[PDB]
Amino acid sequence: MLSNLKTGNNILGLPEFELNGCRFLYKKGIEKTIITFSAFPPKDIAQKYNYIKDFLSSNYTFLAFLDTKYPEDDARGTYYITNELDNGYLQTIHCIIQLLSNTNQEDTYLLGSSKGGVGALLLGLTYNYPNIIINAPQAKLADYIKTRSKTILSYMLGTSKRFQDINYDYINDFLLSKIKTCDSSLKWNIHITCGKDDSYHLNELEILKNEFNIKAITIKTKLISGGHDNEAIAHYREYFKTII
Amino acid sequence: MLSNLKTGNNILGLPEFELNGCRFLYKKGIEKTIITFSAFPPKDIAQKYNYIKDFLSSNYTFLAFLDTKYPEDDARGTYYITNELDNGYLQTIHCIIQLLSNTNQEDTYLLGSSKGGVGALLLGLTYNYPNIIINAPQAKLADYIKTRSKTILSYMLGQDINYDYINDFLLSKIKTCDSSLKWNIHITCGKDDSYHLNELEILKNEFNIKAITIKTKLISGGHDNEAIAHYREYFKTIIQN
Amino acid sequence: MLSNLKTGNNILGLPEFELNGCRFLYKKGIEKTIITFSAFPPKDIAQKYNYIKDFLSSNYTFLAFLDTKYPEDDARGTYYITNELDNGYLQTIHCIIQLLSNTNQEDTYLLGSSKGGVGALLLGLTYNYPNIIINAPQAKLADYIKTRSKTILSYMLGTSKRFQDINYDYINDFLLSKIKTCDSSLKWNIHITCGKDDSYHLNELEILKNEFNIKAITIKTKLISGGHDNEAIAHYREYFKTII
Amino acid sequence: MLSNLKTGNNILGLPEFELNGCRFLYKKGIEKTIITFSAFPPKDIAQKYNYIKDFLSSNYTFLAFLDTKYPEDDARGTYYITNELDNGYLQTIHCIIQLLSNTNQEDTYLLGSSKGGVGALLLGLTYNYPNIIINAPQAKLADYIKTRSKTILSYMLGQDINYDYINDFLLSKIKTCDSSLKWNIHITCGKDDSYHLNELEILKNEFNIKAITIKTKLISGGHDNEAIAHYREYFKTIIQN
Ligand SMILES: [Cl-]
Ligand SMILES: [Cl-]
Ligand SMILES: [Cl-]
Ligand SMILES: [Cl-]
Ligand SMILES: [Gd+3]
Ligand SMILES: [Gd+3]
Ligand SMILES: [Gd+3]
Ligand SMILES: [Gd+3]
């Protein structure tokens, strides 16, 4: 029973639930379903639900997900990838959405910035959510985890040295693999904003656009003000409110 | 959306749903949540939702699950174990129950016979469902599967280490489960079901060293429909008082 | 070098060769290639090359193969199946034929009786030899090995009790599996004789015909005099000389 | 029939054949039989028959083999190991050599560099080819493969036990080989090829406890084409006197 999944935490009036390691907020509404994914917080800061304020006064159904809870010593998530390096966490998110949402999937919108944008893409491309509106995702996920936390990277690489570089490249290509194996016949509605001052994620955006190009999948991209900062976020929020 | 998960099949007036290859019936009631798991049908017979007749005229919330849809050559299920031999299928079942149930887990009852009883044990021990009322479950899964289908076991094998991993898959659940849960496990078995009486003693040994005391009962019949008749009377008696 | 593969044995003037555990005779000729497989000899009798006499005065190319050399305590062969229960022995036979034969495959003819007929079928259906002319093959190979040698069966079943019945049914269906996975688009030229007094192998022939029927593969079958004996063989030899 | 095995490809006037997915060149000569094995080409380059230029103007019998045709994503070969990780491919090579060679095995010479040298060792140690003249072979196969292609290693893995089985696949050949054969194994390695000098010491340790004394020689270069130049001079010197 949903109410028995509560953690005791409360975010802006919304009670937190946890199912099979997946923490989420749920507000039942009408017309549309809005789904958000959390990005990396700073070290020693708890993972935060993204873009609640934009939607708690809305009448839409709202689900906001956090990343995983491991590793314990730097519990800022593993890019929505299980420690078995598979889809078990994305699958849990998918089940929660399909059972708690009261709209069609084409009336479902996936939102997220940076790591959250990758999460939205990973879920949408695995389980055919066509509406993905994100900002500045990474392309090579392991290269980026390395810059944010050596602890999270080391944990995800595993303990055996035989497989560390294997796991590294596997994680590094996890999203790119999702693009290559996704259903090219779906009417994808993917928008990716990026700050014009964000040289890194501008390059990552070219890598992603290239993979979508190879799959004959047209993507909408819009450059916006800012870098990897709150000015880009501010323009991103304005962008996805216009669409939705 | 749940209504978008309908397969178009209807079983006894109950619509069928499917999420992540997991097919289930769902009927919202009150008071209690009853969960059933499918057992092995005969070789060329489709998988059946078990004990639906016992609970269509009841006011309880009811969920009946089928096993997996593979292998295609013999689609009778892989003991609720994925092709990767992990918890992926039990994960989906757990998510379906937790989000569709309108009762507490202590008011939830897992039911099943033979392979259906293993499924109930696999789910309950993994995700702390205390009420498990089953009949004649197997303990060594691969040993039983090969007597029912060489096709399914070989598909699940992908050879030696896989055999032991499947064979002990339920015993490992017992070894791993939460000893401090107030377990309410009832296991019946036919008087004449010698194979599964021994299987029950193998399961009891694992429960025993985990300090889990289960309830058992001999009923008439073998590994047959006579036993299932008395099993059904047993779980109706337990659930209603 | 072929001459360095000799065993020192000599059968009717033909020197025996052995390559990777596979014993064979080879006489180079013209026009056609004749390939024979050995059947079960009696216990404590060496495996025999089949139908040499019919072809040593012929001008055709001739290859005669024996079964495997294991188990050591009853070395009468394992139905041309390796002790890993795979195609490694058939593959060796195929290589020898493709390298020593000087005709096309449709001018190649596979001959054999009983166990040898199964060998011919196993090779022909794995590697697309269309001309197969055999007598009284078995259908359920393990059931038949059980009647001939408990020692060979036990050896092929392996040592671990977990897999004995698995291996039994696997061997029992080895030829039937070959029929189901064979190329149905090949112009098969398969003739199967059987003695009218051979109730057992008449039933096995119905099982085989059924599998060929399911694959939409037409087979020629002819009932001949005798049982599982030298009268059936005698009529079988006459039959395959008429075709070739 | 051999002529029916032609692929239709021609390499430097030599027709290509294929038997059981094994692609080879064959040129009948006299006196000696020279066997070469292909090494890893770059990522998007087709597999090459090695050292064909050294032996087209020679009167020797010549066979050059490629590695396997899988995986399709990166078809540079699986170290002459089948997808089932067994001797199936070396079996076919052995059959081709034994039936097409017109010289004794003591007049047969296996050649190859890097992965090509492993292939020569795998064949020679399995089927008692005494003359092996190679450059800079690897000893831990999986450790090297992953630095050249994550795609090929993962295909070969199908994970942990497979890694060790592949990594030690050549070392097990040494452990299993015939100690009483009059082995004639020459292994060269570039002065500056530190990785493979250490790899050679790992191979030497296995030969050592099998009472097999090999011949080794430092040549100039690293794991590069400078070393291959001196390797080629070395095997021409050995073969001709
Ligand atoms: Cl981030
Ligand atoms: Cl069952
Ligand atoms: Cl026989
Ligand atoms: Cl190489
Ligand atoms: Gd435009
Ligand atoms: Gd513009
Ligand atoms: Gd007619
Ligand atoms: Gd007629």
Numbering used by the authors:
A (entry chain B), C (entry chain B): 1 to 244
B (entry chain A), D (entry chain A): 1 to 158, 164 to 246
Authors' account:
Each protomer consists of a central eight-stranded β-sheet that is sandwiched by six α-helices and capped by a lid area formed by helices α5, α6, and α7. A deep positively charged groove, which traverses the protein surface, allows substrate binding and opens into an active site that is characterized by a catalytic triad composed of S114, H228 and D198.
Consistent with the oligomeric state of CsaC in solution, the crystal packing of all CsaC structures contains a tetrameric assembly with two protein molecules in the asymmetric unit.
